[PDB]
Symmetry: C2
Subunit: 145 residues, 2 copies
């Protein structure tokens, strides 16, 4: 079980969506499956380079220690360093402008689990995570608009 | 949250104690309340520079992210960067050889808790943690010695 992807159109500008995806410590305010987030380290330009995320994995609480990379202007790439449940979690956000106030958010999620869970079930659970993330982001956009 | 200290004489060489204390990922094997420990980053010489420590108490999990320093050749100094319940946790291990086969372990622990727990109560709990580690290290030494 491995890479799943989700594209969703959001009713906000590309810079607003990039700001939401980049405001990691505000994740618990609008994402139900992230209960806490702490910036552990920052690059020399101040951008967060390492995070702690308190997450809910199928209802279990879990802790992720994650590295953050910035491939391009409207792109964010996170890489799990050590976490509960998963041996690998690589997530790429790509923010593609549509119109002045509309944006395509494209999310790739790349996971490997510690327990020998069957392939289709891993991709189903990762797809559900992206489905919920998109709905949570929609709510955050409406709250700020 | 004033600093608490513990000195214990251990019946093992300095190289044995240094190896036990430095083997961070083996901590769960001899500490019952530590469920996991992972090296997150290393210095350029390979020595770990950052750790994740998972503790469990009454089935309740806690996670600590700590930086590791080597201030002197016989010293290991850890500084909590972010953890549950604590705003500060600075712990220093100093390993000094005594006789041909025993060594002195010096541990200082300086903690701050998030809740407004009174100072004297924090230091009492920190002192209990050090006894607790000292007894656990004693067991690990006996388990690892001939």
């Amino acid at each position: 079980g491995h890479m799943v992807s989700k594209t969703v159109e959001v009713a906000a500008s590309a810079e607003t969506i990039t700001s939401i995806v980049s405001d990691f410590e505000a994740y618990p305010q609008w994402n139900p499956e992230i209960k806490g987030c702490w910036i552990l380290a920052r690059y020399n330009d101040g951008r967060p380079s390492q995070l702690r995320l308190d997450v809910e994995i199928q209802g279990q609480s879990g802790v992720f220690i994650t590295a953050v990379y910035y491939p391009a202007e409207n792109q964010i790439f996170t890489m799990l360093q050590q976490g509960d449940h998963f041996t690998k979690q690589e997530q790429r956000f790509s923010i593609v402008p549509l119109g002045p106030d509309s944006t395509l958010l494209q999310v790739d999620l790349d996971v490997e689990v510690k327990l020998p869970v069957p392939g289709p079930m891993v991709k189903k659970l990762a797809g559900e995570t992206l489905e919920h993330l998109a709905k949570a982001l929609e709510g955050r956009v409406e709250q700020l608009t």
